[PDB]
Amino acid sequence: AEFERRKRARQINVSTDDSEVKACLRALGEPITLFGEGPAERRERLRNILSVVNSLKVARLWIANYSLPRAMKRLEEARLHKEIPETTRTSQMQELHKSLRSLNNFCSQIGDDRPISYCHFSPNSKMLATACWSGLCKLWSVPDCNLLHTLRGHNTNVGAIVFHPKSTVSLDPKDVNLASCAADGSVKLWSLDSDEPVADIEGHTVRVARVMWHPSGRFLGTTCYDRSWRLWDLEAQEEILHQEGHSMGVYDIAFHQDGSLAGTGGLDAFGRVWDLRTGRCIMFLEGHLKEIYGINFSPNGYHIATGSGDNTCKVWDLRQRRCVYTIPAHQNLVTGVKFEPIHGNFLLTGAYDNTAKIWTHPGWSPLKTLAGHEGKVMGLDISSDGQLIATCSYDRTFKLWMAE
Amino acid sequence: AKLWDSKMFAEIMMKIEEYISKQAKASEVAAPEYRVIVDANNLTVEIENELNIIHKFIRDKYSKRFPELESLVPNALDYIRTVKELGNSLDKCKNNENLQQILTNATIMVVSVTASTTQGQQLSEEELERLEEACDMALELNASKHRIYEYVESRMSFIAPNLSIIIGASTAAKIMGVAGGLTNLSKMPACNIMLLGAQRKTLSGFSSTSVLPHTGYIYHSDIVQSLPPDLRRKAARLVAAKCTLAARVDSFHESTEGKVGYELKDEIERKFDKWQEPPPVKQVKPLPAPLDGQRKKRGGRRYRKMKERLGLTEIRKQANRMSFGEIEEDAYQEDLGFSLGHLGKSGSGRVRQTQVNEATKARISKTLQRTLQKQS
Amino acid sequence: DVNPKAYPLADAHLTKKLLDLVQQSCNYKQLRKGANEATKTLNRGISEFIVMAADAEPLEIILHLPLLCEDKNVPYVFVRSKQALGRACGVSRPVIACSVTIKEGSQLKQQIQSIQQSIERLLV
Amino acid sequence: PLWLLLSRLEEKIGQLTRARAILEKSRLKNPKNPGLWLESVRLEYRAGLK
Amino acid sequence: LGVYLTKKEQKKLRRQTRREAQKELQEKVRLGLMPPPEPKVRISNLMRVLGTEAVQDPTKVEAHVRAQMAKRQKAHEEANAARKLTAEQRKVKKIKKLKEDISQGVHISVYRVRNLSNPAKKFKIEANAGQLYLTGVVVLHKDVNVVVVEGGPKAQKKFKRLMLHRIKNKCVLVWEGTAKDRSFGEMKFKQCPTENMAREHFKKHGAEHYWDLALSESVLESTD
RNA sequence: AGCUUUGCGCAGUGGCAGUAUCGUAGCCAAUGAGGUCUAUCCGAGGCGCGAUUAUUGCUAAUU
DSSP, X not given: OHHHHHHHHHHSOOOOOHHXXXXXXXXXXXXXXXXXXXXXXXXXXXXXXXXXXXXXXXXXXXXXXXXXXXXXXXXXXXXXXXXSOHHHHXXXXXXXXXXXXXXXXXXXXXXXXXXXXXXXXXXXXSEEEEEETTSOEEEEESSSOOEEEEOOOOSSOEEEEEEOTTTTTTSOTTSOOEEEEETTSOEEEEOSSOSSOSEEEOOOXXXXXXXXXXXXXXXXXXXXXXXXXXXXXXXXXXXXXXXXOOSSOEEEEEEOTTSSEEEEEETTSOEEEEETTTOSEXXXXXXXXXXXXXXXXXXXXXXXXXXXXXXXXXXXXXXXXXXEEEEOOOSSOEEEEEEOSSSSSEEEEEETTTEEEEEETTTOXXXXXXXXOXXXXXXXXXXXXXXXXXXXXXXXXXXXXXXX | OOHHHHHHXXXXXXXXXXXXXXXXXXXXXXXXXXXXXXXXXHHHHHHHHHHHHHHHHHHHHHTTTOTTHHHHOOOHHHHHHHHHHHTTOSSSSGGGTTHHHHSOHHHHHHHHHHHHTOOOOOOOHHHHHHHHHHHHHHHHHHHHHHHHHHHHXXXXXXXXXXXXXXXXHHHHHHHHHXXXXXXXXXXXXXXXXXXXXXXXXXXXXXXTTTSOOSOOTTTTSHHHHXXXXXXXXXXXHHHHHHHHXXXXXXXXXXXXXXXXXXXXXXXXXXXXXXXXXXXXXXXXXXXXXXXXXXXXXXOSHHHHHHHHHHSOXXXXXXXXXXXXSOOOOOOOSSSTTOOOTTTXXXXXXXXXXXXXXXXXXXXXXXXXXXXXXXXX | OOOTTOOSBOOHHHHHHHHXXXXXXXXXXXXXXXXXXXXXXXHHTOEEEEEEESOOSSGGGXXXXXXXXXXXXXXXXXXXXXXXXXXXXXXXXXXXXXXXXXXXXXXXXXXXXXXXXXXXXXXX | OHHHHHHHHHHXXXXXXXXXXXXXXXXXXXXXXXXXXXXXXXXXXHTTOO | OOOXXXXXXXXXXXXXXXXXXXXXXXXXXXXXSSOOOOOOOOSTTHXXXXXXXXXXXXXXXXXXXXXXXXXXXXXXXXXXXXXXOOHHHXXXXXXXXXXXXXXXXXXXXXXXXXXXXXXXXXXXXXXXHHHTTOEEEEEEOSSOEEXXXXXXXXXXXXXXXIIIIIOOOOEEEEEEEEESSXXXXXXXXXXXXXXXXXXXXXXXXXXXXXXXXXXXXXHHHHHO
């Protein structure tokens, strides 16, 4: 009877929104509000009713003209190294291996009272730039850890600061020397004599993770979280290529020492090797699971290494256009992957495992674990001389390593 | 050896930074002004940590003369002023001297009474000279601290624009100085901020309620003190919470206009008005109409227990019976006519005395039992 | 979207895991609600990790918690909702910051360690 | 005791960063030791890095 | 994206559901669809309920009271047992909760043990990996014992705890990480007297780098 | 394969207290309710209003 109808009414789900109740009542044609009918009585009535019922082309041409001779020269350098007796190459190989295994924590300096997100060696291997989350970038002398020229920095956390390739060697200190990226996307240029930014590159409305110059020193590569990476031309003072190829945010960008290629490693878990001369994705990295947080083109010119959250460091061969070896480096998220700047002497890896490891570039076997620190190793860099290793960390300190 | 030696360095640094502060004040009316504020607010901490050391030294030195004054006067500045005023001669008419400004009248009579029976020997002339030197140094440090607080209060519209709106610049200056910095203030819970500047004032034969305990600068702020005393605790708590929010906003240099501060002050004023809101109209409950109809009431365990409790007991049944012609003797002076009746008297008919019914035993309320458990 | 000031923001899966762990901690009497109690736990070093919301307005009222976490070496994470975080804590009122305390011998220790490892590798 | 004494020498030598590195290496080689932690904390406190 | 409920919310829900059920039962009784409830009687309640009837027929009243109590107990047992997980259904729930979704990714841990001669330890590793769906391989050498274990994060954590505390020469975690896809099957415990064919077997699955790391770490430990 | 922890239901048995149990399209509340003690410490509901045999039903009597 009607008791069963009342039982049915209880089981009927009716929206608790007054506007939705009024809309449902009007849809059925019944009066929206009776006299003295509040929202609760309206809901009860609804329940009962329901129960009843051209610069790009010029830049590309310049990059090609700059890169082709360098690629050729690298080719004859490799041919000459092949002509070198195998005994000499082997001997210098174990000399390098013995030198690496003797590395010790040379120094330990508090960069700032906040975690240090990046560290970069100057081209003359005498100055070190550290990027901090406090919004301050600092320049440190390499042989002795002491602050020499602080920077006012950004307002948010600073992602990465990279020296100009010709800085401290050829161009004047008052010119552009450094490019720093922040957590708000702002990119600011710096000079070795002015604490305030020389210039403020704009256009990145979203956070940019890494910023690095082209080896020619004329183009600056920025990677945003807009699934995009941008190339900024210093001479033109305007971004050139806002390439959109990553499915997710783009974290790291690595340039080719020849200058012909550029590699972008993003949160898409896949990497892409764009062609700076033609603007087409020549080779598409695949195999990494989870976001890739590191990438660096080897000075050899045909090897690429990438570090991701898989606790792995995959080495990619450009000649075969495929991965060659997967290095299971560290037991936590890998961030910094970098080869020896001069040649393929070794591979340096850093991760959130508060440790760094060294691997032979050809053999991909461990040599020395740079154990130390007490916080996650955010970034690392090797000096152009090759015997200097700097590893910033979450421990608010950066450390130097030289053979002893 | 150490405190005296460090006193000169502290004074020199304070003088240099106070000259810097005066230069900044003149310039306002690349050495930015924020660093000056940071230096002054660190100077406040340094001055406090030197003044407490000086107060401890004076307390140790003066304890030979009048050892009991430390307990009577817990405040450091009041202790220093009192030992300066009294000096070696306790009974030197200083009681009706400036002590009335230093201390409350009740504690003045307390300290005079205690000094009447000091049982403490006089101090040597070198001990004297050292005591007045320490007192003068402490007073100079207090004056420097007052100058620094004045300068910081003059610049509270920039360092903490939001927190200035709520409690004003003076209370802002006091809480920022006692907290050790705006950053230190932000990294602090609202409960601790409410107790900033609180003093463990001695109660001289009074309840702890009379001498307001756990009350700090915020409790004595203008907005909190404007409420009736029965609502000032809630006012202090709410204002302290909103001031903590503003300080956290201010330490990141956000809402420099004061929009957060204005919103928080408006919320505080609305809550204060709600507390001051007049009570609503409440209907008068009429007397229930007398009723003679039969009413059916359930039985069971509850009814059985109530019947057992309220029911007549043999001890009470026997006390209601009074013998006829057996003129008993008065057993209670304070109330005549009172009698035990047949209890323990001849003619009761019972050889053995009736036992006490345990169902009539006294028991306390459930809420009262909860309060007693909480008190434990 | 969300305030960029809350950079260590958890995704949906980690948000669900964090809310489940917060509810379990509340059931085990191992949780502290509110930014003030989170600050108190951080100052006393009895906090496993701090979960705070990204909808706090203004967000600067809890941005001091990451600094205290860095000082005390305690993981911290940002959740996208202050209403779901409050519900996870067992309180109908929104909660913008909750702290999971340290209790020796607690059966939640393994889950707490797993969540700490997940959070500490997500900030960047 | 060899570790902390060498670190104290490095502090006295004037190269405090080398003392920091030595203490960090000592803590790495001897995990969870209050003795090395105490000296490491005192090193920053005595250097003004409160 | 589920929303949790406060204890007051739970109390309100339970109270209002019980009140609705009680009102429905009372309406059914009053309407005549349900007989009125007989008083609940126990042994201590026997006289208070039927003293007049208990005097005339003590054993009959006792039998009636015990019959009512046994009816209540039987109803309770029938409710409990009716709603009981079948023995096979208990396994199905257990066999599913331990089956993590490796579609997103597989977690791989590599272990190196100095000695693995004990057959009981071999059986422990094999059974624990099989129950936890931890597909992998065990390669036995003179010193190197590569234990590649792949599966779900919960199983990986349990198995790591297994050899770290439950099972004892020492056990060292070489590398714990994730990969896109699995590369080994069930436990096989391959015997590898020499390094060359062990490396070849690891290359068959495409995971020779685990063997390389284990061998290099063992060599470094031996030199140390 | 067993064992066991927490929370939520559903029942069973047992104990205790009826000066208390509920209701909240009323208000306030972890952006802190409320603080006699321990206050640079405590951390959750409070208040107002309403219902009542200090939870509410049947059953049996007299009526």
